Symmetry: C6
């Protein structure tokens, strides 16, 4: 057993993906890297059509072990992104995708990789994503990743960590890509705020004030500070008898201090 396996495409995953705001770049990179890892021919074909004289442009990208690391601040949506991104990959490559979430550790890791290899052999018609929410056992994991990379099996591994320095170096150096979730920049803060406040009549000038109030002005808000503190506070301040007040929303953002690093 594993945990709760999901297949893609999925209406609920798509809805959850859509609800992630300010992560558009992280979505695109995670989705496209996964597509390359399971179907590397698509990257080779893109290279030939657009840059045929390119010698090392993709040579580095293709041969990487099929592991993607999501690293950064807690509460940024890393896990929620990893659990739903397979819907995007399924759309992008037009394949059906089985997600295996990994919930004595050495036995568990081996088993997970053995199952992943077996299912990938049965399947490029489809693909298999192994998801690891943590964190002898490191060696079982390394051997598993290498085994997926040695073969042409349509399989990839996503692993989430709060701090990339927590990861064993032999795991880190095998990541085909590391995607970082640090404090949102002005554009990312703008997207979360605009998307959330749409249809409330908040002007663009008032949005920029909240963008500035949540920036470093010297560290800014985390993604968590926006989604789990500031957004609820703004909504609840008006609920249930009042419309959203930009002056109060700004006063809330300014009095609120960011999570310290």
């Amino acid at each position: 057993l594993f945990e709760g396996a999901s297949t893609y495409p999925d209406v609920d995953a798509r809805e959850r993906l859509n609800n992630l705001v300010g992560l558009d770049t992280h979505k695109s990179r995670l989705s496209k890297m996964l597509a390359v890892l399971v179907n590397p021919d698509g990257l080779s074909a893109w290279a030939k059509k657009h840059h045929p004289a390119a010698e090392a442009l993709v040579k580095n990208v293709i041969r990487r072990p099929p592991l993607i690391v999501l690293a950064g601040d807690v509460g940024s949506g890393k896990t929620e992104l990893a659990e739903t991104i397979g819907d995007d990959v399924a759309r992008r490559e037009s394949i059906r995708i089985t997600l295996l979430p990994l919930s004595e550790m050495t036995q568990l890791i081996s088993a997970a990789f053995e199952h992943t290899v077996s299912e990938a052999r049965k399947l490029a018609r489809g693909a298999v994503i192994l998801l690891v929410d943590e964190a002898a056992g490191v060696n079982a994991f390394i051997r598993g990743i290498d085994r997926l990379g040695n073969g042409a099996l349509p399989a990839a591994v996503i692993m989430c960590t709060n701090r990339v320095d927590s990861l064993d170096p032999a795991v880190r150096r095998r990541a085909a890509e590391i995607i970082t979730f640090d404090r949102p920049n002005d554009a990312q803060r703008r997207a979360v705020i605009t998307t959330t406040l749409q249809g409330t009549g908040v002007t663009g000038s008032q949005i920029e004030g909240l963008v500035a109030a949540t920036g470093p002005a010297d560290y800014g808000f985390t993604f968590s500070d926006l989604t789990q503190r500031l957004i609820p506070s703004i909504v609840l301040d008006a609920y249930p008898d009042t419309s959203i007040n930009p002056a109060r929303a700004l006063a809330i953002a300014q009095a609120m201090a960011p999570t310290a690093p």
Copy 2:
């Protein structure tokens, strides 16, 4: 068993809530978020009446797992707020509320969540608040929170922590809202001081001096520094044979150093 369960509304909880000063914003956010978690229709109805064209305004707020984190300085009143806020929620939603305070840990957490689910099924006529004063066991807690969120059961979890970084990331990322208790700003210091000094003849100009003396001028007083050090010192300085002296109260505030971070 749990500890000492309370039902709301309660005269003593209301009195205790009222005695919490400088926490008006924390009370409102905690009370309203809890109301939304147990009765999400009220937020949807508010959205339609005031912002019908809003697409993602509340979509994020409603679907959150029903967990609220109170994080920040020790002695701010977090626990006292969590133990009494159910009286406010009962008033706001006109419901009767059962509070279950959580006092081998994995068994305890499972049992608490199983009981909470059962009682919530019996009950939206009423609601059930599970309170956690801390801090395998993390997994039991996560499974419990998800189970409350999966259902439409009128139940929520409050948990208090001194530092949010202490919390397991898989707990933190599930908080529907994080409410922070850091050092009171000038308005919050003014409210504690004014409310406490009311009827003593202290002028507003003298209140502002004490507000300034307890601010960063570079960190200011904590809530604890106001309620457990400065307020007793001011009162005891006059007790039992003298009226309150603003000059002495200011001298006390200025000589007193804030709790270091």
Copy 3:
């Protein structure tokens, strides 16, 4: 058993209290808070006579659990103050006071609190002070404090700690008052120096030099630096064949470096 129980008033406690210099404010606050905790009516009566319109002035002070925390630098006299202050409380309230000093920990704490409750029931004619020199067991202590607070029993707890951050948060948040012992300010340094040097012919101008030499000029002397280093050095420098020399006393103070934080 406990340790060595003392009754108040006591000639030796009074003498020891008197020998504590530079702690006049700490004595007054500790003594008056204890009087309020055992005889809360005296605070209510003071409030009515002097500030009858005051609504929340004492409402916060009275309802606090009967615990007082003494926190700060080692060697400041915290323990010596806690062991003798009951003589002051006995004088202030005209009551006889039994001090129980607390010297498997969970059993010890429960027993101490059970004994304290029993003796307080026998006794407001008198009062009982439980003294804790440190530091499951935390839970026994919390339950004990709440039990003393729930009743009208004339009993209070004093506990000493070097750093208040060492204390469990559930202990800290129950303190009715926290009294801090940090580095003496210019007035406190003046009182120790003047009182010690009285009758030696040291001028006030020479006292101010020693006050300045022991200040931050950027941290100053601790109370320990004054009583366990500088004062002996000044006396021994003259002993046994010479009178006290202000020039040498200043040279000693200036060459002596304060205890680093």
Copy 4:
């Protein structure tokens, strides 16, 4: 047993070596030092032909125990370099080279060194490289290194570490050479970027912008930041329907923050 032994020359090692960019200096030093350790006569002959009057020029280099330490940032390619560099040494000295990768620890280290000595005796027609990926056992390792150094056996040891301070001092002081992998300088960043972007039509002026955007401007990108984050992001941004856009590549580099030390 060991792990997976490789012989050199090898087409796949050569390909992997070639794919390492920005490490040209590290390759040359590692390759040449290894050649000297197995065939010290070549260094003596070079010294005589070019600097015959040199007395201590090579006297220090030759007599060193045959250990080379690769130290520095995770994900720089240290391991990949150590696993393939034997192809370069084989070419440089025209010898066949057996690589023994080292996967109860004291027994393992002794055995590895005993095997290495035996094979080196059979073999200067060829050479033996012992590779150590980590990290009583330290003593077995020291004894092994000394034993290789005492003899004229054509054998050397490569060991990789993230931080050289992690290594036992008795290991560190025996390194014939320490080769460091820290943050690439402007030339090294230029080589990675130019080599990767060749044939995409990116101008030299646009390359310099990306060199500047990945420098300290105050720490710069690591090698990992270039190969596992920035390079994939640039490629995936265009893939699969668009050619590489220098403006987007610069915007990506600038918004991306380096790995903190």
Copy 5:
């Protein structure tokens, strides 16, 4: 048993005391405090003859528990001072003094204190010094100190520690005096250098250069840096065929870096 007990006066202790340079103030304070602890009447008599109107001048000094703490940098001579200072006390008070050096810990401490009490009862004709070179057991030590203080027994305790913060607070607060050994000031550096260089023809101007070269100019030499590094280096530089050269001595002092804090 203990270790090696010494009686005073002793020719070898006197010689060792004399060889300690730059500690004149520490010697005087340690010697005089010990004399007061064993013969407190001498301090009272001094007070009456010189400052009869002094009320609290010595009241604090006399009543202290008979413990003296020597705290500060390793290699300052603290231990050597504590092991020989009894010769000075014997001279100052004209008494014979038995030193008991303290080499399951709780039993050892109790026994040492029981023996010390017994011998002090037999003895003010003489006195007993207990010496502790470190560092349940803390409680045995506290009980021992209090027992010596409660009685009029002619006995004192010296304990040495590198950092006073290492000591248990209940030990620290009982010290009658704390004597600190930190980095020598200009006068102390002058005394070590002058005394050592006497009879070598080094001018006073050249001594001041070495005083300046060993000062902070921002921390200066420790006592260890003078006695265990600089002094040997200066002597050995001339030994065995050359006289002491002030220019070389200065060059040595300046190139030598102080021990970092």
Copy 6:
């Protein structure tokens, strides 16, 4: 047993000593201090011939326990110096010297000291050096050192440590001399570079550039940075087909970053 005992003089030790560059001062101090410890009469005789009126000039140096501490950066050559310096002492005093290198710890230390005492009694015709490469057992070591010091036995102890603060204080305070190996100053860097580059045609002006490039300009190269990184890199850069190029040597030194403290 011990490890591998060496006798002096030794041709190989002399060669190894000669190969240590930039340590001339450390060699002289270590060699001369050892000579004094085994033959203290030579220091007394030097004092009389050159400074007969000197009273405390050597009184401090002679009476020290016979222990010398070598402390500082790893890879400076401390161990190599300690293992070969006995050849210098043998030459300086014209004696034959037995070196005992120390490879359940309490038994080992006692045995080593008992053997050292026995051999020294058999031997001033000769001397015995005990060498300790690290680091109850501390007490065995202290007792051993004192025993060597109490007697007139021609024996000394050398111990090496990376950080002197690692040593037990009771060991540190017994060192007759502490000799420190920190980052080479400009003269020491000049000697390593000049000696290594002799006969290569590198000008003095080019040497000064490399001296400046390896200095703090704010910490400079360690001895390890010179001998295990920069020197190999300079040589290997020319090997095997090119003469040494000062321009390349400078470029290498400047791009190379020192080991961080």
